Amino acid sequence: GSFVEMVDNLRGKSGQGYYVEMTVGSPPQTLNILVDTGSSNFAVGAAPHPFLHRYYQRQLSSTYRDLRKGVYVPYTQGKWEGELGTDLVSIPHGPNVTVRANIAAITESDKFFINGSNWEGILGLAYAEIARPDDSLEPFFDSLVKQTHVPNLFSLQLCGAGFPLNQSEVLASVGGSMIIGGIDHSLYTGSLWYTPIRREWYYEVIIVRVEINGQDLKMDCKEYNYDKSIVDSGTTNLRLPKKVFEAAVKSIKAASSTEKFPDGFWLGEQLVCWQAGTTPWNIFPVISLYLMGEVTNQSFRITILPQQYLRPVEDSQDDCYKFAISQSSTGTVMGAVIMEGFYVVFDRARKRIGFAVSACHVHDEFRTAAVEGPFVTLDMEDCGYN
Ligand SMILES: CN1C(=N)N[C@@]2(c3cc(-c4cccc(C#N)c4)cs3)CN(C(=O)c3ccccc3)C[C@H]2C1=O
């Protein structure tokens, strides 16, 4: 229904991620926490760092419990190393509950913390399977559901501004909403359409068809989910497997052919600028992703605009952007590019993910983002990779 206490509780932008305010310890220590559906650890800065304005101080918390166990989390972009423990955790603009959760106290990190970001930790919302060191470390959401009456579901509305936000603006602006234990009807328009969670590790989904301006990409559907397709709030871009990316970029260049862009723009490296208010949105195509439906032989589609896939950046009074669709060697990643177009319901209780047109998506007077169905699709289980 309505969860007014949790509506507008996020801040940030796609390129830097979105964070929620949380408290750790007794007396409560306030920290800004990155919302990450692509990882399963709750981990906070717990030692001084040049990019941290604050950090978790275990010796000042009376409820802190040392697990006497190390935790190492190397990833593609960087790494962090810490010490496992437990403490009492709350979400001020969240449910009115206090939970004892696992905390990875970060003591050493490489390329993890970001200069100028207003976050000090990460909230891994995915399943116990991918948690580090192993699945025995109960993720935050599992502890919250086990210890309280909070329904096993969360929903995210990530709000892209559609223009650059400076440091004071990104601090004063509402970046979106994280609704813990419910679906807020004010954050979306139209219907919610659900896709099954294929397996509970990452939030894995199955893409069954891809269109660029209604034109079928015409690849074997396994290619779209090779080696997996996941919904990840901790990824800025829409990331596509190498073969899909090459086919998508060729189609997008063909649809936008009235204007020639250098190779560096398509690589996500170079920005493209237009005179204030003159971005030619109409020359760029819409992108539709068809997802497996809940009903046998049934699919639905989510459609995004270049206002989602052209990430706004500051250069001048020019309107500048980076191409936010990139190659992946780890399958499809429906990051902030997708997320910003839609209100996304992570229905863990019914092993499904919901999509509806976001009330905060950026569009123009001619086109809007869309969630439509049903469509008749066959051999959909065959689209999943093994
Ligand atoms: C994409 N992606 C992600 N979803 N989560 C991680 C990080 C995201 C960011 C980060 C920082 C600022 C902004 C944004 C944004 N947008 C993201 C830093 S680290 C954490 N991680 C695991 O812990 C893990 C480890 C092993 C296995 C699975 C997950 C995998 C990392 C990753 O590569």
UniProtKB/Swiss-Prot annotation:
Residues of the full protein shown: 58 to 446 of 501
Organism the protein comes from: Homo sapiens (Human)
Domain of life the protein comes from: Eukaryota
Cellular compartments per GO CC: axon; cell surface; dendrite; early endosome; endoplasmic reticulum lumen; endosome; endosome membrane; Golgi apparatus
Family: Belongs to the peptidase A1 family.
Protein name: Beta-secretase 1
Residues annotated as the enzyme's active site: 36, 232
Disulfide links within the chain: 159-360, 221-383, 273-320
Keywords assigned by UniProt, alphabetized: Acetylation, Aspartyl protease, Cell membrane, Cell projection, Cytoplasmic vesicle, Disulfide bond, Endoplasmic reticulum, Endosome, Glycoprotein, Golgi apparatus, Hydrolase, Isopeptide bond, Lipoprotein, Lysosome, Membrane, Palmitate, Phosphoprotein, Protease, Signal, Transmembrane, Transmembrane helix, Ubl conjugation, Zymogen
GO BP term, pick one: amyloid precursor protein catabolic process
